[PDB]
Design a protein around this ligand. Sequence first.
Ligand SMILES: NC(=O)C1=CN([C@@H]2O[C@H](COP(=O)(O)OP(=O)(O)OC[C@H]3O[C@@H](n4cnc5c(N)ncnc54)[C@H](OP(=O)(O)O)[C@@H]3O)[C@@H](O)[C@H]2O)C=CC1
Lengths: 208, 113, 229, 71, 83, 118, 95, 337
Amino acid sequence: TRPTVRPRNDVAHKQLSAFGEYVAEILPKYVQQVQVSCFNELEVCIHPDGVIPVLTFLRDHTNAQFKSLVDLTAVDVPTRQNRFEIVYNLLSLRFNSRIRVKTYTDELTPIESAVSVFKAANWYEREIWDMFGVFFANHPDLRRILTDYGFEGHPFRKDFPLSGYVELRYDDEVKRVVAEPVELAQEFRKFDLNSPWEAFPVYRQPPE
Amino acid sequence: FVKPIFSRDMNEAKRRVRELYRAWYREVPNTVHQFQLDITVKMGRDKVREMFMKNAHVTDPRVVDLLVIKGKIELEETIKVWKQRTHVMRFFHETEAPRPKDFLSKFYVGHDP
Amino acid sequence: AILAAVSSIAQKIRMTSGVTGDWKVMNILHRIASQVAALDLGYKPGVEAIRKNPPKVLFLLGADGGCITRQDLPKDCFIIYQGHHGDVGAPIADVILPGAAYTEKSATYVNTEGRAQQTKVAVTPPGLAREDWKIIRALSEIAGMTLPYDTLDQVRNRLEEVSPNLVRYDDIEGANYFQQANELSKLVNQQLLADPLVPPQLTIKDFYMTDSISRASQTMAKCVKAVTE
Amino acid sequence: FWDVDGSMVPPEWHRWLHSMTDDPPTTKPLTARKFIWTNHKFNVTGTPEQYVPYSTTRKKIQEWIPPSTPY
Amino acid sequence: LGLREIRIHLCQRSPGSQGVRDFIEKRYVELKKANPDLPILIRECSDVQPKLWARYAFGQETNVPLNNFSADQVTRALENVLS
Amino acid sequence: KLDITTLTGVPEEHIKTRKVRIFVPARNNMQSGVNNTKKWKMEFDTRERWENPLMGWASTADPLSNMVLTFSTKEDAVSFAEKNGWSYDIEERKVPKPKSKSYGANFSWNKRTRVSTK
Amino acid sequence: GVRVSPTGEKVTHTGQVYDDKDYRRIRFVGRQKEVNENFAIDLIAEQPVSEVETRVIACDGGGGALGHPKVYINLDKETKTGTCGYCGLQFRQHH
Amino acid sequence: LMPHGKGGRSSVSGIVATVFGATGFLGRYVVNHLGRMGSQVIIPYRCDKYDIMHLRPMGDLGQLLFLEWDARDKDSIRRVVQHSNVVINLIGRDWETKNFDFEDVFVKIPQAIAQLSKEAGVEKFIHVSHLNANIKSSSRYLRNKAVGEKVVRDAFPEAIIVKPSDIFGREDRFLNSFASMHRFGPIPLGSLGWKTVKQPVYVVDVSKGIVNAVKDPDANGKSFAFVGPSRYLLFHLVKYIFAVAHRLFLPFPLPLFAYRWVARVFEISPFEPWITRDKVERMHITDMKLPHLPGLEDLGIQATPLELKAIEVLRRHRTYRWLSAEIEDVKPAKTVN
Ligand SMILES: NC(=O)C1=CN([C@@H]2O[C@H](COP(=O)(O)OP(=O)(O)OC[C@H]3O[C@@H](n4cnc5c(N)ncnc54)[C@H](OP(=O)(O)O)[C@@H]3O)[C@@H](O)[C@H]2O)C=CC1
């Protein structure tokens, strides 16, 4: 229960918890869950219409100066209609604390841009615009990062093939590089390594 | 129901597209000369008319305005003399073989759907 | 004769009563994978007495050398074919037209219980083989009588305007016409009963070679030679 | 010579220049199993000797045999 | 030219099909008795409306829906399509 | 019908040519585990894949062919295929029907279960 | 001494040589098709069959953790040799 | 074999071409078109490995093959054509190489290729002459084609005889030479160009046409004669050439023999001439207007006008003052019809 096991830090869990109810007090209007795992990792909801007003508050001291948007990590789950799950990782430097505060959005919901508030999201912007289509409040430019020029796709939508539909090559008489239909050789020979028989009864969503 | 991107109802959106067409329609020769396209310029304007036709089934103003957002964003890369001649030619797919919509030929080709 | 006899038997057991009456006592075990759907479409009884004059009969599978052969027309032996294995039917035929195996096509099949269930695509036909009915729509398209539907989904759309049960899959259930109207024309005929009455398959050793795949399968040859000696 | 290169060395001595082994193969000659090569042909990308990748594992469906008999 | 195959469709339970159900349970033996040749295929399908296909020359087919029709009206259509 | 047919980057050809398949994946026959029957998933119909003239490799046609997608419910998957504009075919869940069982049911002279030596 | 194809090129140890009709054979032209001289097949049965008067045995492929996992070969039937599932080499119980 | 996959670089087709003349101008194009379809293509070569290196992109791994061979030897030709199902032929040389007399180029070699193709059981041996092939005292090279046309017509009787006229492309000898005259300065022409007329043929069309010709069972002994969209008179044609080159244009008459002498002065070089006594008459010859022979659209491919193709071919010559200039503004050359 020790040589392999990583010890559970109850203390920080206690402090983060208590601060968690503290914040739960402070912004009832958007804050929801106050998740607190044994990893010492706190988490909190925000409604997307509540993106900016919460985040600004975060930067300003209460007992945690949530300075430096370290990340706007993003996840797409097709099942939920609110398929997008934008996440604000954060770190109050003065208090050496860390927190994860996320949201959700639909394909045509103009979620608020923290560009005015953090500016670090001038690109967390355009990536998460481009890879997805998560339209953003008001940004100086929504021009694509990463993906090419005429490129139409939105990879990381967890949709359409990992190769994509596009596969460019130089061509002769046109004297120029041209995009072409894929035609993969050998093909990504995907292995379904999923295991029937649950190893974790403690979890397990009920059949209901 | 859900809150709109920009335009609400088609006319707030329809206003934006025309702004887009001219934004291309004037820009085209500039592109014809910056990249020295061998295409006759009317072909360019025709393609300009065509890409505005592929989006004919659009009916939600959020879809229209999001399409002109992305289309103006493409215009950004165009006007700033970004891209390359090849990228301009990607719209043409001229290297690719023509597709026979006729079913009989589709029979003759391969297994297909 | 056995038909009218057994119909009389099931009706008689209905006369015995104690039956719920919705029991649908009258039933049979088909061994064929195709006749049941053709009869859902009610094409014909399938009587072979027809094998008279017609030139240029078309072969769908044509796996048996029994029910049909080229003595039907002394003159022309011109006979079109669209099976997939070459066993039996193919050599007899001329101007052969190769076609798909079952896993490859998405074409449907009807269970004997009236259950409808389409095949789905797998490895696709090996070469110049294609979807079976597509050649038909091609010939008709050349014949000056092109079929209005295009996609296989659209021929399925046609099945609703005729079958109309092929469009529905898991729907075994229906109105069920009941033995009243059924029996009445059964008794307006009658046929002599006879001898003998023997199952086609007899024993295990004969069970290994039926259709072109079961026939041509090598495991079947090894297995039948196993059950022999 | 005036065309010398790598791959000219034998595999035992090939282990020796790289100093994987302090001891030259002289002192410890290797297993010398029957199927290993002896001349050591070195790399040959040009010239008529030349590796060719190719299809392996024969056939698939075995296309149907046409009749030889007329009629 | 008058017919080659004729066929009908019928909801298993619907009120608009019920009189037709009663009909097939009765007179269908008579009409079927009338025509040893031309099939009168019948289907149980719970398609939203009861239906009447009737092929003529070169595969052309009439198609009268049987929704909200009494069996007498059904027959009334039936003699009409004898040819 | 909130189509995102243009909002997605997909070629029109792949949305026209094919219907997708919504379903609930089957349990292994060769294995005991029921565990993957749970959670819906949708998968596109397979296409022909000619062999590579060299080295005998697979040479896939349609790029999208290996796609797979889990869903909490059936209406969920239907909603996705509707949002995305592809045609689909719904399929029912297949939980096995319960079977009464008992240790002694194997036995009893009258029931003709009996089994035999044990 | 690999069996020679009608075209004259040697067949692979997994026999599969191309048809005379086959255009693909053109690839080998101007070059050399390569096939291994040492078929393992001959070398399987080339070896003497080991025999032990005992019963159940345990092959390891020679070399502790330098070969196949330890395996217990049965010798219930003297009518046949006990070929390894790994080594491929036979065993028997002489008596 | 038979085609599989969507028609592209990785999809297969049964084609097994042996394109002689792949080293040259047209050959890289026809190889590009065979290769784009995913058909495998043999490419026999004599010039050197480096010369055709640029073709490597055109294929996909196994799709291309390279083979050295002597024209002088017959057996090598036998080896290269063995597995060929089709054998396209493009060997030629306008200026006539010294060591290999011009005669062989359209006589001995095409014939050996034809017989060996017959022994090979080639499904479709193919040969490419020219619209100006009917025997003429002018242009021995043009005269030689007629003999090659017939010998090929006999040794392999069902051979197609392609007759393209003045194909123009980026590397075309015919279009470029006219553009290259600005370096020359003055612009001689045999009695100007008013007497003679031409109907130049675009090359990508000729190539794709060769492909579709391979694809058509119907063609065999057919003697195809490719023709351009438009039948421009030669003088107004040069007008257009510098009209797009934007270079100074100073035409003048010059006697055909007198021009022939200067061409002879330019034939002295082992180094390849821009001007030759073949080129003289081959220019001065008119293009025959033939209707009876099969159309270009029989292959289903539309003719592409030179005006839609010229500026890309000639931008390299136009001066920086003009090198970046709009296309529409040159105004098209006058057509005889
Ligand atoms: N506009 C035009 O150019 C027209 C051309 N034609 C005819 O069609 C053919 C194609 O023209 P094009 O490809 O432009 O001419 P090219 O000179 O470009 O093509 C000929 C190629 O074949 C090679 N070749 C031929 N014979 C030999 C030999 N004996 N030894 C070594 N190399 C040889 C040449 O040299 P290597 O391969 O060694 O480098 C060259 O690569 C020509 O034969 C021409 O007469 C007809 C009408 C119009």
